[PDB]
Amino acid sequence: DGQKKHYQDEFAAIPLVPKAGDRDEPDMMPAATQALPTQPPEGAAEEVRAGDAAAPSLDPATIAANNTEFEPEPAPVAPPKPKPVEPPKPKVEAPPAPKPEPKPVVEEKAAPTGKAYVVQLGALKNADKVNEIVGKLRGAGYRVYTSPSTPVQGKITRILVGPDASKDKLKGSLGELKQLSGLSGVVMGYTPN
Secondary structure, X not given: OOOOOOOOOOOOOOOOOOOOOOOOOOOOXXXXXXXXXXXXXXXXXXXXXXXXXXXXXXOOOOOOOHHHOOOOOOOOOOOOXXXXXXXXXXXXXXXXXXXXXXXXXOXXXXXXXXXXXXXXXXXXXXXXXXXXXXXXXXXXXXXXEEOOOOOOOOOOEEEEEEXXXXXXXXXXXXXXXXXXXXXXXXXXXXXXX
């Protein structure tokens, strides 16, 4: 019981450096009733006891914003001004003659079913047209699937190339996927059902 613990409540990483480190409680688990006479107020709660609020005021969602999709404050990536993202000058959709295996993708990556990805080339309510788009790609043996519930005539059927749960594997592949499918596909995050 001190007026100054040290700086915040320490419990993690206390190699016998503080007097006790672990806060000696007056009544709850370490003894009962009078376990801690308590001459200075110590902490009690005050307002911010320990894990109170603990919420970034600037960042609404650090795990969603920030470097997740490049969010710079000093130099914001505003649309105007022509800026490339390292164009395929040395090689433009060059098909690897040998198949490279930089660590088998038998891991999660992004997350299984969580942060999956898919490339939407089309979306139409005419299944006749659906059969073409899928017939072009899936018929050629590419990983091609359609909108969540069911392709049907009259309802919107989206056509998506490259269903995969590995964003790293697949979402980095979109550049060469324009060779793989060659259809006009937009980057969409896949959430299986």
